[PDB]
From Swiss-Prot:
Disulfide partners: C7-C137, C25-C41, C109-C210, C116-C183, C148-C162, C173-C197
Keywords: Calcium, Digestion, Disulfide bond, Hydrolase, Metal-binding, Protease, Secreted, Serine protease, Signal, Zymogen
Record: residues binding Ca(2+): E52, N54, V57, E62
Cofactor detail note: Binds 1 Ca(2+) ion per subunit.
Cofactor entry: Ca(2+)
Species classification: Eukaryota, Metazoa, Chordata, Craniata, Vertebrata
Post-translational changes noted in the entry: Subsequent cleavage after Lys-125 leads to alpha-trypsin. Further cleavage after Lys-170 yields pseudotrypsin. A cleavage may also occur after Arg-99. Not sulfated on tyrosine residue(s).
Localisation per UniProt entry: Secreted, Extracellular space
Binding locations of substrate: D171, S172, Q174, G175, S177
The name this protein goes by in its record: Serine protease 1
Peptidase S1 domain location: 1-221
Quaternary structure and partners: Interacts with SERPINA1.
Stated family: Belongs to the peptidase S1 family.
Amino acid sequence: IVGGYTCGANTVPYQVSLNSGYHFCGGSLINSQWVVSAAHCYKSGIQVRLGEDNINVVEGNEQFISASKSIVHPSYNSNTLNNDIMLIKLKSAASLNSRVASISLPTSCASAGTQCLISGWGNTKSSGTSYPDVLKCLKAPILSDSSCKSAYPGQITSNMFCAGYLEGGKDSCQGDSGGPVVCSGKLQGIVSWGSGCAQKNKPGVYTKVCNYVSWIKQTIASN
Ligand SMILES: [Ca+2]
């Protein structure tokens, strides 16, 4: 997260870190057994780390649970990032309390102008590289479809939306991938892609979770 703030420990209780020997992506806990992330975060041997603040220090609220199975969206295209969503099942159910909690799925899509909270452990610099240990947060609005398409001609599908600031300076970034965009207590987006980070006229692009609720529910019901 570039141009954000320190969230505060366990203030974003649905935020998870995906670990394969190291943090590599965010994700969102959606029930005791299941995490939503980006398909571009797929790999084998994922451990899901819940209850994290400092990802390099055991601070007392962590739950580390290996994934039993990952399901990339059936229509994910890694070239275009269309359908950049993946479900991860935990081998055991997480213990839920106020520091580790699921986030609700949307019942309706969000509109441009809605304010959201984006979070993660990704790079905090727009030029060069600095990875934080503690969770970072950014409040940002959803942008109009027209501004999003104008920013990224030929690239924005109906399964994507832009959020952030066209002036630059405030965005998600590498290592935030897969993490949440939450608006009015609903998971509306997944950190997906963008050109660089926090660049002028190049906002963040996010998977439009409301399009996937049917798929998520039916997949959980049968897996
Ligand atoms: Ca920790």
